[PDB]
Symmetry: C2
Subunit: 66 residues, 2 copies
């Protein structure tokens, strides 16, 4: 498992206004919990705790939206 900003395809973060949203999103993807965390995206983005290793997270670099 690992922590990170869960990614939208490809390498794009989920912007957020609410911790509740990130908790829903992260847990549906198998994480323990999620938070709406400062500046993964300009503003805040969802950061998940103990996501399964097979779920992609954001890495430094560009967002290439599918």
């Amino acid at each position: 498992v690992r922590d990170g900003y869960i990614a939208l395809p490809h390498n794009c973060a989920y912007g957020c206004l609410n911790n509740e949203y990130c908790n829903n999103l992260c847990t549906k993807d198998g994480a323990k919990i999620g938070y709406c965390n400062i500046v993964g995206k300009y503003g805040n983005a969802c950061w998940c705790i103990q996501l399964p290793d097979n779920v992609p997270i954001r890495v430094p670099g560009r967002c290439h939206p599918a």
Copy 2:
């Protein structure tokens, strides 16, 4: 141990701009890790994970300055 917004008297949270700060603050106080998460209308605050029970966290109610 419990998770929460580490508190400054009186029942005030620590505002933040970077995760690094919250991580330092939380871990120096015995928490596992810390994050700078959303805490309302345009503002973020430090959230600590598994903060020991000798360190106060925010509870419902207003922040009373000083």
